[PDB]
């Protein structure tokens, strides 16, 4: 019971305040500027999102499946969700469209 190592790098359902804020702030902004409102797969948006500073995996959340992240994010009025034989596809909600179109066109000139 000695040579177990352990390391202590567990418990992702308690860092939902930090990881859901850093993941939904950059993911919901990246989803809004780079995509607009499109039916697109969240793992394509996640793998797109983490190529920047923000390198988080879905597994860092309190959502044990992507389905539960789609159950939570879909619930806030930010995303619309559907399931196919090829995955989990989300169509995002165009919030304030002048924010969506200013993300899309203008925010590209500075960031």
Short mmCIF file of C-alpha atoms in Angstrom, two decimals:
data_model
loop_
_atom_site.label_atom_id
_atom_site.label_comp_id
_atom_site.label_asym_id
_atom_site.label_seq_id
_atom_site.Cartn_x
_atom_site.Cartn_y
_atom_site.Cartn_z
CA UNK A 1 0.00 0.00 0.00
CA UNK A 2 3.21 2.01 -0.15
CA UNK A 3 4.51 2.39 -3.78
CA UNK A 4 1.19 3.82 -5.19
CA UNK A 5 2.62 7.21 -6.45
CA UNK A 6 -0.92 8.77 -6.56
CA UNK A 7 0.05 12.36 -7.75
CA UNK A 8 -3.37 13.77 -6.77
CA UNK A 9 -4.42 15.19 -10.24
CA UNK A 10 -8.16 14.26 -9.93
CA UNK A 11 -11.63 15.78 -9.25
CA UNK A 12 -12.71 17.88 -12.37
CA UNK A 13 -16.37 18.56 -11.15
CA UNK A 14 -15.10 21.12 -8.55
CA UNK A 15 -13.18 23.41 -11.02
CA UNK A 16 -16.47 24.23 -12.97
CA UNK A 17 -16.26 27.93 -11.78
CA UNK A 18 -12.74 28.40 -13.32
CA UNK A 19 -12.82 25.90 -16.29
CA UNK A 20 -16.48 26.67 -17.33
CA UNK A 21 -15.67 30.45 -17.20
CA UNK A 22 -12.36 30.11 -19.25
CA UNK A 23 -13.93 27.45 -21.55
CA UNK A 24 -17.35 29.25 -22.12
CA UNK A 25 -15.75 32.81 -22.31
CA UNK A 26 -13.23 31.86 -25.07
CA UNK A 27 -15.39 28.96 -26.62
CA UNK A 28 -18.66 31.01 -26.69
CA UNK A 29 -16.66 34.04 -28.08
CA UNK A 30 -14.80 31.79 -30.66
CA UNK A 31 -18.15 30.05 -31.54
CA UNK A 32 -19.70 33.50 -31.96
CA UNK A 33 -16.91 35.18 -34.13
CA UNK A 34 -15.48 32.26 -36.02
CA UNK A 35 -18.79 30.39 -36.61
CA UNK A 36 -21.92 32.77 -36.10
CA UNK A 37 -24.82 30.37 -35.79
CA UNK A 38 -24.06 27.12 -37.61
CA UNK A 39 -24.91 23.44 -36.95
CA UNK A 40 -21.36 22.28 -36.04
CA UNK A 41 -19.77 19.56 -33.83
CA UNK A 42 -18.55 20.76 -30.33
CA UNK A 43 -15.28 18.63 -30.55
CA UNK A 44 -14.45 20.62 -33.83
CA UNK A 45 -15.08 23.90 -31.90
CA UNK A 46 -13.11 22.54 -28.74
CA UNK A 47 -10.08 21.40 -30.91
CA UNK A 48 -10.29 24.79 -32.71
CA UNK A 49 -10.58 26.76 -29.36
CA UNK A 50 -7.58 25.07 -27.57
CA UNK A 51 -5.04 25.87 -30.37
CA UNK A 52 -4.74 29.28 -28.55
CA UNK A 53 -3.75 29.91 -24.77
CA UNK A 54 -6.80 28.16 -23.33
CA UNK A 55 -5.77 24.42 -23.60
CA UNK A 56 -8.53 22.71 -21.60
CA UNK A 57 -9.99 19.30 -22.48
CA UNK A 58 -13.85 18.62 -21.95
CA UNK A 59 -12.80 16.17 -19.32
CA UNK A 60 -11.69 19.25 -17.08
CA UNK A 61 -15.46 20.03 -16.56
CA UNK A 62 -18.27 18.52 -14.35
CA UNK A 63 -19.77 17.13 -17.60
CA UNK A 64 -18.63 13.41 -17.77
CA UNK A 65 -19.91 13.13 -21.37
CA UNK A 66 -20.21 15.90 -24.11
CA UNK A 67 -24.03 15.24 -23.92
CA UNK A 68 -24.18 16.81 -20.41
CA UNK A 69 -22.24 19.96 -21.63
CA UNK A 70 -24.86 20.12 -24.47
CA UNK A 71 -27.60 19.63 -21.77
CA UNK A 72 -26.15 22.63 -19.71
CA UNK A 73 -25.00 25.10 -22.54
CA UNK A 74 -28.18 24.37 -24.59
CA UNK A 75 -30.16 25.39 -21.48
CA UNK A 76 -28.75 28.93 -21.13
CA UNK A 77 -30.01 30.31 -24.48
CA UNK A 78 -26.57 30.21 -26.09
CA UNK A 79 -26.90 26.92 -28.00
CA UNK A 80 -29.45 24.66 -29.84
CA UNK A 81 -28.65 20.88 -29.97
CA UNK A 82 -29.35 17.76 -32.10
CA UNK A 83 -27.89 14.18 -32.23
CA UNK A 84 -27.06 12.12 -35.36
CA UNK A 85 -25.31 8.88 -36.21
CA UNK A 86 -22.06 10.97 -36.64
CA UNK A 87 -22.01 12.76 -33.20
CA UNK A 88 -23.36 15.72 -31.20
CA UNK A 89 -24.12 18.77 -33.41
CA UNK A 90 -24.93 22.16 -31.89
CA UNK A 91 -26.47 25.15 -33.69
CA UNK A 92 -25.68 28.25 -31.60
CA UNK A 93 -28.39 30.94 -30.67
CA UNK A 94 -27.52 34.39 -32.29
CA UNK A 95 -27.71 36.22 -28.85
CA UNK A 96 -27.46 39.91 -29.81
CA UNK A 97 -26.86 39.63 -33.66
CA UNK A 98 -24.98 42.99 -33.75
CA UNK A 99 -22.56 41.20 -31.32
CA UNK A 100 -22.46 38.09 -33.74
CA UNK A 101 -21.94 40.24 -36.91
CA UNK A 102 -19.39 42.57 -35.05
CA UNK A 103 -17.57 39.35 -33.88
CA UNK A 104 -17.62 37.95 -37.46
CA UNK A 105 -16.64 41.19 -39.37
CA UNK A 106 -14.96 43.78 -37.02
CA UNK A 107 -13.22 41.84 -34.15
CA UNK A 108 -11.16 40.20 -36.92
CA UNK A 109 -9.41 43.59 -37.60
CA UNK A 110 -7.97 43.72 -34.02
CA UNK A 111 -7.99 40.03 -32.87
#
